[PDB]
Amino acid sequence: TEDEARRRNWIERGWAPWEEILTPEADFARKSLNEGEEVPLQSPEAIEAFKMLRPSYRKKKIKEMGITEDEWYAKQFEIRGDKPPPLDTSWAGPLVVRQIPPRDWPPKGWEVDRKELEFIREAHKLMAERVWLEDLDKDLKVGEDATVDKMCLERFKVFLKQYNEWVEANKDRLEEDSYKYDQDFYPGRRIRGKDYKEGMYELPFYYPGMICEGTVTTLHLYQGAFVDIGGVHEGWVPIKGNDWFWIRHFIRVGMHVIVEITAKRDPYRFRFPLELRFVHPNIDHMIFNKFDFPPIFHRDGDTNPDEIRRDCGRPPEPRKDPGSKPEEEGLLSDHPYVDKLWQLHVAEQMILDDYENPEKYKGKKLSELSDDEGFDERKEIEHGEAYYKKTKLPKVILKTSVKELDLEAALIERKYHNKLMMEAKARGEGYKIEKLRRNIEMDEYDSLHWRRSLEEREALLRDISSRQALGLPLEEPGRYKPG
Amino acid sequence: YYGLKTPPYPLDALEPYMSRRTLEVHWGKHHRGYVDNLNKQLGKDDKLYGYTMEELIKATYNNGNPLPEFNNAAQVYNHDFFWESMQPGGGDMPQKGVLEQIEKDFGSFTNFREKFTNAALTQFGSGWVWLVLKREERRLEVVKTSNAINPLVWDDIPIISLDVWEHSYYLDYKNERGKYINTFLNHLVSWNAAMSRMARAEAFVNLGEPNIPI
Amino acid sequence: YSDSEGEMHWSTDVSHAPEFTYSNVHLLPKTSHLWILSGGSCILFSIHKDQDQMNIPYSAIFHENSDLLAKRRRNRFLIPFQIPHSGISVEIPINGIFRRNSIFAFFLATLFPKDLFREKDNIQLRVCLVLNWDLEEVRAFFVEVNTKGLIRDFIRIGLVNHGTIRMFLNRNKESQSLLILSSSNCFRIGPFIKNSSGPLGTAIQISNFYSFLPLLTYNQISVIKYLQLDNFKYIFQVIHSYLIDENGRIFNLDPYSNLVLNPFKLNWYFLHQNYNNNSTIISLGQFFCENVCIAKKEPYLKSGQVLIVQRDSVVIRSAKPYLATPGAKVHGHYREILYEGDT
Amino acid sequence: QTPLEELYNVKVERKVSQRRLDELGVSRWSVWKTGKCKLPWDWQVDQLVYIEEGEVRVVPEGSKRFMQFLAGDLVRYPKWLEADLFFNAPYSERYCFKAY
Amino acid sequence: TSTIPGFNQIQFEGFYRFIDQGLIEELSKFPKIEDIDHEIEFQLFVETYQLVEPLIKERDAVYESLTYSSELYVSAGLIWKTNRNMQEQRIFIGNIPLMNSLGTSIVNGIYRVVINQILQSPGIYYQSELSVYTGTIISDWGGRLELEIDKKARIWARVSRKQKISILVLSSAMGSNLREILENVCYPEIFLSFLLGRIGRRNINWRLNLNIPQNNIFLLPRDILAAADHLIGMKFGMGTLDDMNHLKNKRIRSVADLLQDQLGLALARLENVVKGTIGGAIRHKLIPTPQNLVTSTPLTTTYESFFGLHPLSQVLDRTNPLTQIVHGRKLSYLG
Amino acid sequence: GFELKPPPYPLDALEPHMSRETLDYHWGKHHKTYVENLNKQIVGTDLDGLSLEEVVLLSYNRGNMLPAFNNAAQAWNHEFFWESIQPGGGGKPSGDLLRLIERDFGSFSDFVERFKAAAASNFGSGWTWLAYKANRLDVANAVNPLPKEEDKKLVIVKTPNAVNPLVWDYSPLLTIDTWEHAYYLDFENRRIEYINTFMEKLVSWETVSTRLESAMARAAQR
Ligand SMILES: [Fe+3]
Ligand SMILES: [Fe+3]
């Protein structure tokens, strides 16, 4: 079925019949080859294309039709047909507006008079006041009595004070940061250098829900319209793909438009920091190819996908469902310091095994032992190889510094257990030491870690029951997928 | 900071279906309480302050591990949405593009009423019931959400909601939530509001279909 | 053969339905050009999305107590070698790699100190002593502890300026595809009080329209679908601009005219238009053959698609046309990635 | 760039007053101490931690930055977070795991 | 790269490869050998393989009419019973003929050169018979397997002129069910409508764009599934036929691969010689490790019969200095 | 199966503090409907003939809780709530219960301010429990060598909707219902006045202490 596949190409595959502008020989090919291999051409249009193959004939056609030859070179780019039905865009009542300061004032890390800021911020409660169209006209101030001096804009004027002070302190830093981070200018980027005009609105001046008059300065087929709304950044209306096939008729470059700011993004992370919507040329009934997420930069300083996603709100990288259930697993008792304690343990024992060649240790305390010459503290582990029965295995070599070792008390145990082992010989038996102070310590650390794992699991069980009752996610929503 | 936005209508206007006392307590003390708690929280985090109401809800949902501020912001929004979702003279039947969309997405308005009633009866504990426009699937759905949770956390666009917290009906209806639900659907629900919400949703979820050239 | 990597486009004259269901081969009923739009092929499809701009590309004690030097962990153990002083003898596969039910020692005394807590292990030991578990492998390797020139050995056994992404949802939603667009693909063809752009302010909820952020305009479809009967009296074909101050006083310097207040300068100014329902030579998405031209000026257009239109120039994504004849078969769905040398 | 603890939303009340520690009940929180090691962990639950002594360097999985917490910082590790905690010197904390 | 290679280097690098791996590779396939009563066991410890240099130099071997050869020894375990009934003697496994540096083997006094063989490369190929789309796996053993479509798909695997079975039936015999077919093929409702060596693995992965790990050296059922899916591709025209005669579809077996094959044969003869001598040891008792239960005959006579008889081992054309080189760079389709 | 046990007092007995209208709706409608829908669910099912505590623990299913669970848990919670209060209740506990409160909260006033905070911040519907926490996990490493007396704390824990501490193998001691229907007729939005009234004038500390004795008995049986 042809038309169903045409629709499937439009909707899914992104097809559109983008008109092709052809040199007259390519048109002659794309017409004559419809009729045969070497047939004498019969179609009037193919004969016309054959005649157009001479520019002198094109000249004569120009003179006969009277259209100037640059006007004809323009007219060859005309849309091939089926122009869309004109927009009939109608205002939903009057545009009734308040000068309300942005809510994200001040910018991050900028410090302001917090009592002035609280005065500014009192304006935001005004958004809860009703306005009715049955009530606007009865009290309407007009003319001389609507001159600016009649309007209470004092919280906005304080906002403008703080804004101008911020611009004065930051316009140069922001231009430097633009040249540092953004190599080439592109519509969403900060207007900079010879293109910057003193008095362009900085990005803190804008906020979602603000209405702007602007000019459509550029169209990009894959991104949408970019609009000068008076700022150092162009606003962005997301329009993508074959939607432009109709919108190309209505949203030209150079149009004046009314737009609504719909989101304001960080200009470092996000490629287009002001998302916009067209209000007057309302085209919402022809934008089908919505963006799932606002485009971002992947930058020289970025190094961790998870950190970029949560810097921009993308969902996590899927993983395979582990099939285990978090709460059904064991409890990690094995404290990670115990391996290091074990090194320290055997190091103490090694020292004591050399102190019980006693003549080498005469003249100093055990706590007075140093490391040897050349003791490289800057790597804990060496690697190498070891051999037995004509075969080889890897060897890991663990350095331990004598400064780490509790040697005096370890000696106290050594001497105590030696004495008991002699009494054990007087008992007529061996002497199994059940634990040393290092093994006791390692068990204490394991008990602390098991206690964490217990209290974690118990809180997890409460959490699970609460989330299941409340329909909240147990695992991180984006983290796992089956395929 | 957010103001306590009134109901569109006078608090007596939903009589007899929702009593003046019920509205006075539900707006003037519950909703007021959420507004004041939210303002007291936003007074001490400028980051959460700088977000829009929908951004604030979505950020404080914290991808399913809600921040302390979530319940207040979400309840403030949910009640703002609820008052406009009702009106005096809230008719039995939608009209125009709301009815068209319901009939294409539910097959009939009767199926819609059945799904909404079943969602609001089977919602356990406190919660909300939403007629929402799904964003990726360009279709209406009915979703019930517990406590303060609302569709904005999933980036779905809400169209109508019914409060299913007991404080919304217990004075007038006590245990029989079903009669409150039926009274809402018959006498309170504002399909004119559903129309304006659909019209705003169309700015973000185009639920027509393209015209494809030959 | 596709002389470059890129994506397939066919504006018209190619059938939109494959020759045989479950094929990518499309018949040509008339002559057409198949365009290949250039693009660099390649991804963490979570984090890479469309239009993302990638700028990056021996003591007597230990004869009986060497079990205090051994250790056992979640899937590990260490045993001293002196062969262990405890008199249990250890043996290992020549490559160090054990298998299920492998002997690791032959000969009870404790091999390891009894820790109070013993987390569930995949490694099992059972009595000569044999090691077992549950593609995971258990391997031996030596650990040496070195302190002040003393050495002690333990066997450890354990169980072991760049381009914009443009991207496609595809024949199924996981099989997404990428083209890097870049200066290798896209090129600019050469150049061919008072009002100003700016905020008007913040638009308020007009509570006759039941939306928190107001709907400001209806398109021709929305007036049919979503315009309430009682709101018809307020649908205006011209912008009416009102301002409300912080005391709720409402202002309109001339209600017959489109005056509005710029926040930065606090003076009334005229909007550029009444904004009622009432151009460039070349348009988005058009394709050019080589040596077409807009005017007698020397910059003939190169072959490609207009990606970007600006006030005085356009940016063209390079594409090459392939002329094809009726009954030629085209090996691809629309927008298929063709690699270089693909049929 | 944005601070690492802000991206991960690891709340940190640095230099906490006793007026907050006795509200939270930190004296009754379980003790954990660690010396000098690496602990890889995935927080299946939010953890509230008061660092009684020492220092911790926390590196989220795959990250090349770290966030540092010192004695007298009160850290709320969020659930689902996965990080490698590095302790370079004797370290002690009291913790409570907090369910929804 | 920078210069004309040494002409004999193709032989040289082949022979060194045979020494550098072919000995380990072929000795590793020597099994444990068990007696008829399941009580006595013999094995070569391949890790001890030791080529001692030829005790006779080339110019003496050519004069005395002998083979210039190195001697392979390996230690051999033999458990004649439990416990200490073990010997592990180093035993002489036999002469392997060594190459001289210009690329030739002196065998019974006569210089021989191993001509390179050209074969059809392992992999998968599609032929349009008469349209009859016909897939064919070639394993590096030379074994064919055939797949076919003549009309309306219904792909048959073909085993013999009277033996054809539908590929879903073959996959069911290989233990893959219709759910695995549905999951693992691009056009599963077409399938449902019906109701190799390292070189081979490489070439089938390349030609089918598969990503099976190299360690799966044998054919997997999913390889046959992919072959049928690509055959459906060919039926639709989503692919190309392959021209078998083209030089791109050929491989070259050098002195290395022929000598390695002959070591395989020599060790399989050694297996039969150990089994038969263990028999004589288990019936006549006789003596343990007389050298061992090994004779020199298998290797020595295998290699010397290879050189004497194999069509790709030919007397060196010593006519002039050019033919001495060119002979060792011939490439023969025979063999 | 199960039956709606009346609260262990006359329905007038709470009148200054929890009105007879409140009791009539909360017991005679809400709890009645929980226990009758529970009965309708369990009849003809492997859950019938079991004890209510066991129907709760089973129908919790270790999360992915079965449709019976909400009714089973609400019936148990309400029975526990009615026994948790009395005419002339409140004041201060005695003996082991006071000793444990002073151990785990430092005084009875800290406990009461922390139960009141918990209850006043159980957002939505649900419950706030004082519980004796002698739970055992099934993990397989859950058991503690060297057990100590301090372990087996009293805990204040708040639970949403129908959830109760039985599902964690805790033993509940005191519960305050924080569903609106528990107080809306008497206090409307003033949950904090309802909690104050509950702790000051309703709590059956004798019953909490008897429940604590039973929790001791269960724990020492181990
Ligand atoms: Fe409410
Ligand atoms: Fe209740």
Coordinates of N, CA, C and O in Angstrom, one line a residue, chain E residues 199-254:
Chain E
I199 N 40.4 -19.9 10.6 CA 40.2 -19.1 9.4 C 38.7 -19.1 9.1 O 38.2 -18.1 8.6
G200 N 38.0 -20.3 9.3 CA 36.6 -20.3 9.0 C 35.8 -19.4 9.9 O 34.9 -18.7 9.4
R201 N 36.1 -19.4 11.2 CA 35.4 -18.5 12.1 C 35.6 -17.1 11.7 O 34.7 -16.3 11.7
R202 N 36.9 -16.7 11.4 CA 37.1 -15.3 10.9 C 36.3 -15.0 9.7 O 35.6 -14.0 9.7
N203 N 36.3 -15.9 8.7 CA 35.7 -15.5 7.4 C 34.2 -15.5 7.5 O 33.5 -14.7 6.9
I204 N 33.6 -16.4 8.3 CA 32.2 -16.4 8.5 C 31.7 -15.2 9.3 O 30.7 -14.6 9.0
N205 N 32.5 -14.8 10.4 CA 32.2 -13.6 11.1 C 32.2 -12.4 10.2 O 31.3 -11.6 10.2
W206 N 33.3 -12.3 9.4 CA 33.4 -11.2 8.4 C 32.3 -11.1 7.4 O 31.7 -10.1 7.2
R207 N 32.0 -12.3 6.8 CA 31.0 -12.3 5.7 C 29.6 -12.2 6.2 O 28.7 -11.6 5.5
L208 N 29.3 -12.6 7.5 CA 28.0 -12.4 8.1 C 27.9 -11.2 9.0 O 26.8 -11.1 9.6
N209 N 29.0 -10.5 9.2 CA 29.0 -9.4 10.2 C 28.7 -9.9 11.6 O 28.4 -9.1 12.5
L210 N 28.9 -11.2 11.9 CA 28.7 -11.7 13.2 C 29.8 -11.3 14.1 O 30.9 -10.9 13.7
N211 N 29.6 -11.5 15.4 CA 30.5 -11.1 16.5 C 30.7 -12.3 17.5 O 30.9 -12.1 18.7
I212 N 30.7 -13.5 17.0 CA 31.0 -14.7 17.8 C 32.4 -14.6 18.2 O 33.3 -14.4 17.4
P213 N 32.8 -14.8 19.5 CA 34.2 -14.8 19.9 C 35.0 -15.9 19.2 O 34.5 -16.9 18.9
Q214 N 36.2 -15.6 19.0 CA 37.1 -16.4 18.2 C 37.3 -17.8 18.9 O 37.5 -18.8 18.2
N215 N 37.1 -17.9 20.2 CA 37.3 -19.2 20.9 C 36.2 -20.2 20.5 O 36.5 -21.4 20.7
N216 N 35.1 -19.8 20.0 CA 34.1 -20.7 19.4 C 34.6 -21.1 18.0 O 34.1 -20.7 16.9
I217 N 35.7 -21.9 18.0 CA 36.3 -22.3 16.7 C 35.4 -23.1 15.9 O 35.5 -23.1 14.6
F218 N 34.5 -23.9 16.5 CA 33.6 -24.7 15.7 C 32.4 -23.9 15.2 O 32.1 -22.8 15.7
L219 N 31.6 -24.5 14.3 CA 30.4 -24.0 13.9 C 29.4 -24.0 15.0 O 29.2 -25.0 15.7
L220 N 28.7 -22.9 15.2 CA 27.6 -22.8 16.1 C 26.3 -22.8 15.4 O 26.2 -22.5 14.2
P221 N 25.2 -23.3 16.0 CA 23.9 -23.3 15.3 C 23.5 -21.9 14.9 O 22.8 -21.7 13.8
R222 N 23.8 -20.9 15.7 CA 23.5 -19.5 15.3 C 24.3 -19.1 14.1 O 23.8 -18.2 13.4
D223 N 25.4 -19.7 13.7 CA 26.0 -19.5 12.4 C 25.1 -19.9 11.3 O 25.0 -19.2 10.3
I224 N 24.5 -21.1 11.4 CA 23.6 -21.6 10.4 C 22.3 -20.7 10.3 O 21.8 -20.4 9.2
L225 N 21.8 -20.2 11.5 CA 20.7 -19.3 11.5 C 21.1 -18.0 10.7 O 20.3 -17.5 9.9
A226 N 22.3 -17.5 11.0 CA 22.7 -16.3 10.3 C 22.9 -16.5 8.8 O 22.6 -15.7 8.0
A227 N 23.4 -17.7 8.5 CA 23.5 -18.1 7.0 C 22.2 -18.1 6.4 O 22.0 -17.7 5.2
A228 N 21.1 -18.7 7.0 CA 19.8 -18.7 6.5 C 19.2 -17.3 6.4 O 18.5 -16.9 5.4
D229 N 19.5 -16.4 7.4 CA 19.0 -15.0 7.3 C 19.6 -14.3 6.2 O 19.0 -13.6 5.4
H230 N 21.0 -14.4 6.0 CA 21.6 -13.8 4.8 C 21.1 -14.5 3.5 O 21.2 -13.8 2.5
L231 N 20.7 -15.7 3.5 CA 20.2 -16.3 2.3 C 18.9 -15.7 2.0 O 18.6 -15.5 0.8
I232 N 18.0 -15.4 3.0 CA 16.8 -14.7 2.7 C 17.1 -13.3 2.2 O 16.5 -12.8 1.3
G233 N 18.2 -12.7 2.7 CA 18.7 -11.4 2.2 C 19.0 -11.5 0.7 O 18.6 -10.7 -0.1
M234 N 19.7 -12.6 0.3 CA 20.1 -12.8 -1.1 C 18.8 -13.0 -1.9 O 18.7 -12.5 -3.1
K235 N 17.8 -13.7 -1.4 CA 16.5 -13.9 -2.1 C 15.9 -12.6 -2.4 O 15.4 -12.4 -3.5
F236 N 15.8 -11.7 -1.4 CA 15.3 -10.4 -1.6 C 16.3 -9.5 -2.5 O 15.8 -8.5 -3.0
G237 N 17.5 -9.9 -2.6 CA 18.5 -9.0 -3.2 C 19.3 -8.1 -2.2 O 20.0 -7.3 -2.7
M238 N 19.1 -8.3 -0.9 CA 19.8 -7.6 0.1 C 21.2 -8.2 0.4 O 21.5 -8.6 1.5
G239 N 22.0 -8.2 -0.7 CA 23.3 -8.8 -0.6 C 24.0 -8.9 -1.9 O 23.6 -8.2 -2.9
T240 N 24.9 -9.8 -2.0 CA 25.6 -10.2 -3.3 C 25.9 -11.6 -3.3 O 26.2 -12.3 -2.3
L241 N 25.9 -12.2 -4.6 CA 26.5 -13.5 -4.8 C 28.0 -13.4 -4.7 O 28.6 -12.3 -4.9
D242 N 28.7 -14.5 -4.5 CA 30.2 -14.5 -4.4 C 30.7 -15.4 -5.6 O 30.2 -16.4 -5.9
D243 N 31.8 -14.8 -6.2 CA 32.5 -15.5 -7.3 C 33.6 -16.3 -6.7 O 34.6 -15.8 -6.1
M244 N 33.5 -17.7 -6.8 CA 34.4 -18.6 -6.2 C 35.8 -18.6 -6.9 O 36.8 -18.8 -6.2
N245 N 35.8 -18.3 -8.2 CA 37.1 -18.4 -8.9 C 38.0 -17.3 -8.6 O 39.2 -17.4 -8.9
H246 N 37.5 -16.2 -8.0 CA 38.4 -15.0 -7.8 C 39.4 -15.2 -6.8 O 39.2 -15.9 -5.8
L247 N 40.6 -14.7 -7.0 CA 41.8 -14.8 -6.1 C 41.5 -14.4 -4.7 O 42.2 -14.8 -3.8
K248 N 40.5 -13.5 -4.5 CA 40.2 -13.0 -3.2 C 39.7 -14.2 -2.3 O 39.8 -14.1 -1.1
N249 N 39.1 -15.2 -2.9 CA 38.5 -16.3 -2.2 C 39.4 -17.5 -2.1 O 38.9 -18.7 -2.0
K250 N 40.7 -17.3 -2.2 CA 41.7 -18.4 -2.0 C 42.6 -18.1 -0.8 O 42.8 -17.0 -0.4
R251 N 43.1 -19.2 -0.3 CA 44.1 -19.2 0.8 C 45.3 -20.1 0.3 O 45.2 -20.9 -0.6
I252 N 46.4 -19.8 0.9 CA 47.7 -20.4 0.6 C 48.2 -21.2 1.8 O 48.3 -20.7 2.9
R253 N 48.3 -22.5 1.6 CA 49.0 -23.4 2.6 C 50.4 -23.5 2.2 O 50.8 -23.9 1.1
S254 N 51.3 -23.2 3.2 CA 52.7 -23.1 3.0 C 53.4 -24.4 3.5 O 52.7 -25.4 3.8

